[PDB]
UniProtKB/Swiss-Prot annotation, chains A, B:
Protein name (database record): Phospholipase A2, major isoenzyme
Disulfide topology: 11-77, 27-124, 29-45, 44-105, 51-98, 61-91, 84-96
Organism listed in the record: Sus scrofa
Similarity comment: family membership: Belongs to the phospholipase A2 family.
N6-palmitoyl lysine lipid sites: 56
GO biological process, one term: lipid catabolic process
Lineage: Eukaryota, Metazoa, Chordata, Craniata, Vertebrata
Residues at the active site: 48, 99
Keyword field: Autocatalytic cleavage, Calcium, Disulfide bond, Hydrolase, Lipid metabolism, Lipoprotein, Metal-binding, Palmitate, Phospholipid metabolism, Pyrrolidone carboxylic acid, Secreted, Signal, Zymogen
Post-translational events: Acylation causes dimerization.
Extra remark: Loss of activity upon alkylation of His-48 with p-bromo phenacyl bromide; Ca(2+) and Ba(2+) protect against inactivation.
Gene: PLA2G1B
Length: 124, 124
């Protein structure tokens, strides 16, 4: 679930403001996404977008006929470190893993301010 | 912009978890929006939607070539009172008011558990 994904990001990037920082960055960070990613961070986002597409295709997620951002899962934070609970059944694990991978990726990639809030219409 | 809407929701509603409690509610609180709203709180969401559409068709917003969540404005919170700053240019002031009206609306609309995370393709 999206709020979880936001919570995950905070985990890895302790003082972050995830909506403020990552929603409307590059061509792919924020609802929507097309064109060539503008940096590694941007590529983190296109990857998460794909993962979710994969998720919706995955047989285990067949009864999931809403957005993956609507699928609750179980995860926990231990000092910047994210764990997707063994508990999770197969769809929820895959999604949780999608969201987990993205936050780590976020927490590794450079954030280039200039890439924020792009005229996606004119550059993506 | 979206981060500011979240904060507005947190202002008008001290206890709130905006992404967790208002995202994926009813037929309109979330992505897209069709169907018959299920209750007042949904209608707050439908109303906001209608407000962002009004903004995409606003002459004052003609150079806003993208979605109003990406539009940043000036606001303040005081004693559960959200303030759209008078120095806002018109598009900004318009967007800001769509948000506080929705944020205020959430605060007075009753929250129905049973309308949370609905099967939308089925019921909306
Ligand atoms: C701001 C308040 C939201 C909570 C109450 C809102 C009431 C209902 C209005 C709809 C809310 C908008 C829902 C859409 C959210 C879009 O969010 C999608 C996401 C934006 O940031 C997500 C992040 F992970 F970064 F935190 O982009 P994505 O590319 O998936 O991730 C980078
Ligand atoms: Ca995206
Ligand atoms: Ca909506």
């Amino acid at each position: 679930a999206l709020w979880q994904f936001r919570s995950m990001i905070k985990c890895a990037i302790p003082g972050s403001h995830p909506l403020m920082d990552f929603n409307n960055y590059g061509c792919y960070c924020g609802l929507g996404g097309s064109g060539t990613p503008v940096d590694e961070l941007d590529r983190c986002c296109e990857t998460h977008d794909n993962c979710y597409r994969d998720a919706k295709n995955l047989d285990s997620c067949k009864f999931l006929v809403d957005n993956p951002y609507t699928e609750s899962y179980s995860y926990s934070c231990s000092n910047t470190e994210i764990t997707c609970n063994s508990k999770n059944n197969a769809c929820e694990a895959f999604i949780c893993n999608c969201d987990r991978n993205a936050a780590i990726c976020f927490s590794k990639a450079p954030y280039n301010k200039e890439h924020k809030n792009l005229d996606t219409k004119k550059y993506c």
